[PDB]
Amino acid sequence: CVASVTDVVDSRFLVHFDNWDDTYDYWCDPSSPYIHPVGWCQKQGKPLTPPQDYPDPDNFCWEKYLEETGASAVPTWAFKVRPPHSFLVNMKLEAVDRRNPALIRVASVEDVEDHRIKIHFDGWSHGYDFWIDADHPDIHPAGWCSKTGHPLQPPL
Amino acid sequence: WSWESYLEEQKAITAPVSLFQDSQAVTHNKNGFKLGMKLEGIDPQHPSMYFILTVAEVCGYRLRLHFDGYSECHDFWVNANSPDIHPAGWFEKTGHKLQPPKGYKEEEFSWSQYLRSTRAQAAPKHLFVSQSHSPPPLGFQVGMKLEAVDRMNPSLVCVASVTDVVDSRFLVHFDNWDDTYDYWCDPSSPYIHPVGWCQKQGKPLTPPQDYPDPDNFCWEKYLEETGASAVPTWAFKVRPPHSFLVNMKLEAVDRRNPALIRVASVEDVEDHRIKIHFDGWSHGYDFWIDADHPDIHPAGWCSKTGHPLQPPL
Amino acid sequence: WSWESYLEEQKAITAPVSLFQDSQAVTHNKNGFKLGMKLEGIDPQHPSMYFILTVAEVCGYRLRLHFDGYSECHDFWVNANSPDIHPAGWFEKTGHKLQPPKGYKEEEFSWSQYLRSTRAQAAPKHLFVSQSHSPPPLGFQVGMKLEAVDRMNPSLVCVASVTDVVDSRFLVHFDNWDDTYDYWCDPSSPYIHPVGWCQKQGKPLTPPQDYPDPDNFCWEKYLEETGASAVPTWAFKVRPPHSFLVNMKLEAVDRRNPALIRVASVEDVEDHRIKIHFDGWSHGYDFWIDADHPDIHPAGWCSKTGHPLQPPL
Amino acid sequence: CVASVTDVVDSRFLVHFDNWDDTYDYWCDPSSPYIHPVGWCQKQGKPLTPPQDYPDPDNFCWEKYLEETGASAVPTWAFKVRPPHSFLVNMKLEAVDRRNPALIRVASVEDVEDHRIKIHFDGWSHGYDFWIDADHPDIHPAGWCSKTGHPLQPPL
Amino acid sequence: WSWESYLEEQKAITAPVSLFQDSQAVTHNKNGFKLGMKLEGIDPQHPSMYFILTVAEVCGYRLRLHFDGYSECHDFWVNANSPDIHPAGWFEKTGHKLQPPKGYKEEEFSWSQYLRSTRAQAAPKHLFVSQSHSPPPLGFQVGMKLEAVDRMNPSLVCVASVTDVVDSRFLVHFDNWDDTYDYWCDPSSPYIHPVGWCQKQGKPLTPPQDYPDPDNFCWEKYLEETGASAVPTWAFKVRPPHSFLVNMKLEAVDRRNPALIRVASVEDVEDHRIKIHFDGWSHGYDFWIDADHPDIHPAGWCSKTGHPLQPPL
Fold it and tell me: Where are the MBT repeats (chains A, D)?
């Protein structure tokens, strides 16, 4: 989708979707694999969702939207390559339980994508398995709990 | 670090607050400017022209402004109490020309439409010290003529005009030249003088560029010819020499990177200018500045407004 | 402050927009006049004469005009839709006399040369509501005669002529007098009447100053003598009495300082005039004004055009 | 205002104001300067008048209303630009008398707008002047009455 | 390309000359080294070992050295004020072993015979800053033991010995490990600590390689067994952190192509190290370097010494 930077704080910035709520916004850095330069959709083949309630949606032109909004496109040299993570299936780690975030549990890598891992809580049903970004703040190496003084939930 | 400790070890004093203009010293005003807010302001390199500007960054009582539609390389820093920025709609209400965002035409631009299209907020009016809601400076009306020192070539006193008036200040323009050499000032500016000052004082007057018979320049006939009146002599006020002394310490924006403000010292003085030295750095970076320049401040200014202070090297 | 709240606490209403002429009410036109721009206009104190004028100040939909070459004390305020200003070159194209800037001669003045010499911009034509590009008002031709009330001495109805025609308006001149008592109007003006109105109505007719045998004045022979025709009776249109009522509130320029516009109230009414009172001030400042005067406006006018509104005292 | 197409006859359609008296309905064609696609008011910053007796007049929303009503918007492409007419002030013509429509009078163009002319009947008071759309069936070129055999009322 | 123009373009500052050690900043010394001269020096990869070396190239204040008898793929660059090179005859007068040119035996090499065989000239003694004539590092004697950070594996603090003393520096050697881990330092080095430091800090101590009983390494017993003393605690000096700041610009030798020196920036700081980034290049080439390293230099060093500077990109 068509997006803007609406906030900059130290090494990070806020991605906002044009003509929408802040509900769908998210913080990231220049190496985020979720962001791309102006003209990426057309060059790659996939269609671009234009701003909500925009006049003539299927007839959306970037260069004229930019001129119109007195905005410049983020320059292509700004978008950095983050390599795929190197987590492998069955590696174990510690992860905050999303059903009760006070708790951190023994966990396992159940599956992988380029930039995401699927977490499984050891001893619990696979139904609680969830996808998470590899750089998410709520996953941690084994030992993290013990060395910081937070209880670790053992497996069931 | 701390000023208190630094002054002990250096056996020095800070320039007292009373030596500064209220506007250079004031720390208790909140910076209400926020990221993305839209406004109008002068282009520093072309001080006669106005542009649409966006708040790109805020740092304490300072902000960095971006020229909508244009490159980020032209971004510049001002203080939140800058008189050279104005609220959306100000150009239209006060007889100023808007240079619109890149790709627009002067009369194609509407604030209403622009805000709908960008979904941006205009910086609220109450943020601005200068909105042309104050009666002008005494005796300086647009079109009126005076003598003015070319600040870029200070060995020249030249034929000049007032071409802009905004609250207590006015724009000095050099006749038949670019706006590149123009500058904003007030009636107490030590750089301006009444018609007939050159002849009375002895120094020669540079007449307008490409003027017929330059050495044969007559003020009273230039005035009649241009349907202009000279600014009246009672209008030009005495500003006393500043009272800064060598070795007084203060805070100053680094001209090599204006995002930064540093510990500094008065290295030398003139009647209306001081020479700044950045403590711990080479004297080669020393620069002359007007005593009433917005980018010098009393010790403590950074700490009380929330802007980082670069300690000495 | 706010009008909405003020009307609640005072338990009053504003004069509705529909009560005003479109020209007194219109807020959606941009003021395109800019500082330093040059133009032509009438001198308010001598409404038959035209001068070169410079835009000295803009405030919302109003501007202050300066008489080139002359003192700033004669500066005056008009609205941007004033019919009494015209673009550069208008005098020459429409048969009007230019009083040139102080020190020039009528036929020594060229706009081309003046603009080259001043390096000024002429206010563009498209800014002006009145440029003589519209066919005149019906039946009022220059030289034609009528009866007119001396607005300065309203107990007099006098021999008068049309001496100027510009778009929908014309200049009423009193014969054998100064232009000092002249005034602009339209065919619906309640101050003008056809030849023979005095005799038919009963009141006496003041004949021209220094006329031979004043009490023995005959219209039909004055006409033959001056090779003039009377304005035809079908030309004089009925303007209905205005519908302003006592206590209606509105906005009005302060005559003691015309830069200012204030909250005001209708204190009293006549058929074609209202008595203005500035809310919060003494009744001693109350003044009579024509209902179609350009300097009265509906509540909200200031806010919608960008001009400050003085709240009540 | 919120409106609907309620009739289609040959090259024209009838515009109806949702839940208002049918006396406000009018016939037009795709080029009419009085109609606009759903969303036009929002795009222009103009207030939109909702249907009469709308259950929640504060928060009228087009998307919800269309869904609730089982209705589609006329697509934006259907709306055509009609060029302004070329009548000029003081041109003369023939016009039917609004007050006595049996009669057709000598008339003049008193004023112009982009799509309308103000008619003045020669010799009569300006108080009888009226605005009329330029495409209105009851204005005609000079000579129309004589050529069709209708009496023409002279000025006065 | 100029530094001045680039700095202005980037609103950037160079690291001042005052932040560098004199030896890194000095530009006014002449390079007296000439092509084909012979000398002695350490192998940078095996810093305890000494070889016969020949000047293969000179570039400003730098020279490329060739290992006599060996392949040119081992050539390396030093500055002309390098303390890691010595004049012919030095090894024999100071108790250092020579690794002779490929195919010679150590007892078989004689400088006088070699110079005669090659018909070459020995670099003159006056070129060399280090001839082992200056005062030794207080408290550090050959054979004395200490705790040292493995700079190749900096999580490890290890049993180490002083194995060489040359002028004001000494060589740290890791007991029974490859000499490739040895490094030269001075008493102020942040990488060395007195015997017992790990114990006092609660850090694990890495014992010598192949230590007979690695479980129970004990310093007292080891010192006794080895006939060795500890370097006394008083000899160890606090070195203050450097004063480089992030984004300051400088010049740095390219690690991958050491013939070249590039425009560089301080990407990050630590107390005794800076992370270097080459302007215009990928951040993947960034590297950490000790602040006292001979191959970082102030802006202007190349131009003043006559070495080409690679511009950004």
Answer: 60-155
Q: Does D39 touch chain A (CB under 8 A)?
A: yes
The residues facing B11 across adjacent strands are none
Q: Which residues of chain E lie closer than 8 angstroms to B253, CB-CB?
A: none
- Distinct helix (H) and strand (E) counts, chain C: 7, 17
E strands present in chain B: 38-43, 46-59, 62-67, 76-79, 85-86, 98-99, 145-149, 157-166, 169-174, 183-185, 192-193, 205-206, 249-253, 261-269, 273-278, 287-290, 296-297
Q: Which residues pair with A94 in a beta bridge?
A: A106, A140
Residues C88, C38 contacting (CB under 8 angstroms): yes
Helix (H) or strand (E) run with residue C116 in it: helix C111-118
User: Resolution, in Å, please?
Assistant: 1.9
Q: Which residues contact E17 (CB under 8 A, 6 or more apart)?
A: E25, E298
Tell me how the structure was determined: X-ray
Sign, Cα dihedral of E193, E199, E201, E204: positive
3-class SS of residue C127 = helix
Measuring CA to CA, which residue among B3, B78, B80 is closest to residue B42? B78
Question: Using CB atoms within 10 A of its CB, is residue D114 exposed (0-12), middle (13-18) or buried (19+)?
Answer: exposed
B-interface mutation test, from E3, E5, E11, most B Cβ less than 10 A away: E11
CB C298, CB C15: distance < 8 Å: yes
With breaks defined as C to next N over 2.5 Å, after which residues does chain A break?
none
Between CA E220 and CA C311 the distance in angstroms is 93
Domains in chain D (CATH in brackets) are 1-84 (2.30.30.140), 85-156 (2.30.30.140)
Q: What span, in angstroms and rounded, lies between the C-alpha atoms of C118 and C112?
A: 10
The token pair at B133 is: 């809601």
Is any Cβ of chain B less than 8 angstroms from the Cβ of C196?
Answer: no
CB of E52 within 8 A of CB of E100? yes
Dist. CA A20–CA C122, nearest whole Å: 46
